[PDB]
């Protein structure tokens, strides 16, 4: 029993972190096979940051403009190219610790583990959701750029995020491992702001299923709702519209608990309208939206505490 | 910026996890050098669980009664002994992945990272506090016994917890790596219950410092309090008494923010008495008690967002 925000074991990713220096800028890189991936903003200096032209900044560098350190060992750069907002630095050594991996672009609402890293050395791990507005609520200081986000399926690491920047609200933006940003953001110091966010409805519902599997039913009611009547209420409370796809995704959790999705929806409608009356759900006084249905299945018992 | 419950990178601990079988019971073991540590309740079968005599159960086993698997490789047991509620199985191979490590007995209120493990294979990592009543609010299923808790200082792993059992409230109990339980609990299936818990006052205060360092001051007030007047209020709200030692521990955070401890105490007194008025602190609608002062210093910038 219990329910915690649980990150993937980070060992396979720790063995891939390096430090990348260019001029007086140091940040983190990811070393797989004989390539090191890092944010391209490593090539900026102070002033470059406002209006940098990366093609023009890069063509001015050689291979030996880049210093790469793996632990206490210098990796020699024998090649470099730019791919979107990332650099791909070819090095002379293949990483002997390279796990099976994939690059994946996660979708809004999905979760992943972040390995916060400084000067190429891992310092902590925590679980994030990709918000609807394409930012994450991370925890990052200066020097954390190039820290990556990932999931693990079997023994395969699916990398999905590389950290690039912090926005004025203290939330975070970055790219997939193709260097394509999540959201409308750009790697330069303009006046960009996170758009308005929404509560992730599918996840709140998954988490209500988790509470049931774990033995708690207090928030349920005798009612049902239609997808549409639910969505009218959803909009009023800044929740994402529920779709039939979301209803189908919730199938297996519905089956394990015996609670029809739209019945769980009515329960949710009631919680939004009435509050929790000073009670908790899985120890929480608020409606948690950062566990997916897959997160609940991965953590909860396959047997309901009936 | 940001503030997350952050676990230590788990790689050094993942390389030490094995599976230990005895009869039809499988659980996790920790492999350092040529010793594997596991809960001694591995030697119980069904019925043994209520009134087991471990000395009598153990003397009936040989070395080859124990099956130990490291990944896909069988480690041969050449020795075994009991130490408190743990077994120490000597094996023929020294773990080539043994990190620098210590065994430490953590104190109530202190935190640590848990590597949840099943059948010797790590499945997730999350941060816990040791509650005042010597339990943790973990997330564990059947097969999770022998999963360990740890901190990392530099590159040294300080192991502090091994998981043994779940109590009726869904919270968890276990031992240090000497096999001595945290709390009055015993490794048999009696009618034991967690004692009443308390809120960890020192940590709540550390977390209020974290909120200030991160730029937020809304909860402060013009008042001060004495240690004693504070404690009268503390008792009324099920908070631990504040001690002078706690005040001294909070020194560096006090210094970084310019807020005297007892002034932060007055602010806390006010929050307990009045509530948060529908506002959040570091994104939380409740007073968080699972970050130590060391957790705040390890995660927050050394520069206050003034
Ligand atoms: C990692 C970079 C690194 O590790 O090595 C040194 C370059 C930084 C991590 C950030 C900083 C704190 N926490 C983090 O997550 N990333 C950056 O410093 C990037 C750098 C950069 C350089 C060139 C081109 C593009 C990006 N910059 C930012 O994150 C930047 C920080 C501004 C900020 O919000 O912090 C304070 C201290 C001023 C409050 N953010 C940014 O430009 O956002 C857009 C914006 C700027 C100004 C006004 C309004 C919006
Ligand atoms: C790990 C053991 C393992 O991995 O391999 C198989 C042995 C178990 C992890 C627990 C179970 C679910 N989550 C966890 O954290 N640990 C146990 O099963 C131990 C086993 C044991 C055997 C012999 C001697 C001592 C301990 N037992 C318990 O945790 C036990 C479980 C009872 C429980 O609360 O679960 C449900 C399903 C019945 C709700 N807890 C226990 O004995 O607590 C004291 C108590 C028992 C009965 C009534 C009141 C209090």
Q: How many helices (H) and strands (E) does chain B have?
A: 8, 13
Full DSSP string of B65-95:
GEEEEETTEEEPEEEEEEETTEEEEEESS--
Pick from A4, A137, A301: CB nearest B2: A137
Q: Using CB atoms and an 8 Å cut-off, which of residues 6-35 of chain B contact chain A?
A: 6-12, 14-15
Distance CA A182, CA A105 (A): 9
Beta bridge partners of B35: B32, B90
Distance CA B19, CA B300 (A): 37
The sign one gets for the Cα dihedral A242, A246, A251, A256 is negative
Distance CA B299, CA B293 (A): 10
Interior/surface letters B92-123, b for 16+ CB within 10 angstroms, e for the rest: eeebebbbebeebebebbbbbbbbbbbebebb
Domain A198-301 in this protein, CATH class: mainly alpha
- Please answer yes or no on whether A124 and B299 come within 8 Å at the CB atom: yes
Q: Please say whether the beta carbons of B128 and B66 come within 8 A.
A: no
Beta bridge partners of A127: A113
Domain with CATH 1.10.1840.10 in chain B: 198-301
A213: contact with B, CB 8 A cutoff: no
In three state form, how does the secondary structure of A241-282 look?
CCCHHHHHHCHHHHHHHCCCHHHHHHHHHHHHHHCCCCCCEC
**Could you give the C-alpha distances from B299 to A128, A139, B8, B29, B152, in angstroms and in order?**
16, 8, 11, 31, 14
Residues at CB less than 6 angstroms from ligand 2? B 25, 27, 41, 44, 49, 140-145, 165-168, 172, 187-189, 191-192
- Please answer yes or no on whether B125 and A6 come within 8 Å at the CB atom: yes
Best residue of B5, B7, B171 to probe chain A, by most A CBs closer than 10 Å: B7
Q: Please say whether the beta carbons of A58 and A43 come within 8 A.
A: yes
| CA–CA min distance A64, chain B (Å) | 30
Distance B189 CA to ligand 2 centre (A): 7
Angle of helix A201-213 relative to helix A261-274, nearest 10 degrees, comes to 100
Question: Measured between beta carbons, which residues in chain A are less than 8 angstroms from residue B142?
Answer: 301
Domain with CATH 2.40.10.10 in chain B: 1-14+100-197, 15-99
B291: contact with A, CB 8 A cutoff: no
Ligand 2 atom nearest the C-alpha of B48 is 23
Distance A214 CA to ligand 2 centre (A): 16
In three state form, how does the secondary structure of A36-70 look?
EEEEHHHHCCCCCCCCCCHHHHHHCCCHHHEEEEE
Query: Does residue A145 have an active-site annotation?
Result: yes
Q: Which fold has domain A1-14+100-197?
A: Thrombin, subunit H (2.40.10)
Closest listed residue to residue A65, CA positions, set A20, A103, A29, A116: A20
Resolution (Å) of this entry:
2.1
Cα dihedral B219, B233, B200, B250, rounded to 10, equals 60
Interior/surface letters B201-239, b for 16+ CB within 10 angstroms, e for the rest: bbbbbbbbbbbbbbebeebbeeeebebeebbebbeeeeb
Per-residue DSSP letter, B216: -
Rg (CA), chain A: 22
Pick from B7, B122, B215: CB nearest A126: B7
Q: Which fold has domain A15-99?
A: Thrombin, subunit H (2.40.10)
Distance of CA A3 to the CA centre of its chain: 19
In three state form, how does the secondary structure of chain A look?
CCCCCCECCCHHHHCCEEEEEECCEEEEEEEECCEEEEEHHHHCCCCCCCCCCHHHHHHCCCHHHEEEEECCEEECEEEEEEECCEEEEEECCCCCCCCEEEECCCCCCCEEEEEEEECCEEEEEEEEECCCCCCECCCCCCCCCCCEEEEEECCEEEEEEEEEEECCCCCEEEECCCCCECCCCCCCCCCCCCCCCCECHHHHHHHHHHHHHCCCCCCCCCCCCCHHHHHHHHHHCCECCCCHHHHHHCHHHHHHHCCCHHHHHHHHHHHHHHCCCCCCECCECCCCCCCCHHHHHHHCCCCCCC
| CA–CA min distance A39, chain B (Å) | 19
Residue of A nearest to B214 (CA): A170
Distance CA A288, CA A292 (A): 10
């Amino acid at each position: 029993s219990g329910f915690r925000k649980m990150a993937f074991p980070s060992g396979k990713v720790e063995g891939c972190m390096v430090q990348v220096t260019c001029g007086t800028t140091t940040l983190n890189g990811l070393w797989l096979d004989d390539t090191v991936y890092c944010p391209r903003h490593v090539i900026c200096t102070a002033e470059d940051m406002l209006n940098p032209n990366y093609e023009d900044l890069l063509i001015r560098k050689s291979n030996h403009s880049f210093l790469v350190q793996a632990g206490n060992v210098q990796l020699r750069v024998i090649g470099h190219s730019m791919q979107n907002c990332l650099l791909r630095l070819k090095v002379d050594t293949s990483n002997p610790k390279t796990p099976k991996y994939k690059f994946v672009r996660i979708q809004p609402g999905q979760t992943f583990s972040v390995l916060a890293c400084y000067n190429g050395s891992p310092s902590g791990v925590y679980q994030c959701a990709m918000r609807p507005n394409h930012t994450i609520k991370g925890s990052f200081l200066n020097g954390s750029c190039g820290s990556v986000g990932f999931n693990i399926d079997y023994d395969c690491v699916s990398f999905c995020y590389m950290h690039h920047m912090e926005l004025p609200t203290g939330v975070h933006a970055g790219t997939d491992l193709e260097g394509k940003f999540y959201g409308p953001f750009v790697d330069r110091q303009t006046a960009q702001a996170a758009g308005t966010d929404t509560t992730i409805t599918l996840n709140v519902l998954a988490w209500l299923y988790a509470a049931v599997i774990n033995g708690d039913r207090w928030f349920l009611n005798r009612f049902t709702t239609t997808l549409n009547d639910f969505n009218l209420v959803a909009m009023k409370y800044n929740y994402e519209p529920l779709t039939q796809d979301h209803v189908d995704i919730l199938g297996p959790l519905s089956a394990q608990t015996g609670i029809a999705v739209l019945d769980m929806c009515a329960a949710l409608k009631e919680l939004l309208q009435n509050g929790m009356n000073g009670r908790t759900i899985l120890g929480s006084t608020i409606l948690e939206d950062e566990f997916t249905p897959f997160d609940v299945v991965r953590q909860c018992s396959g047997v309901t505490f009936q």
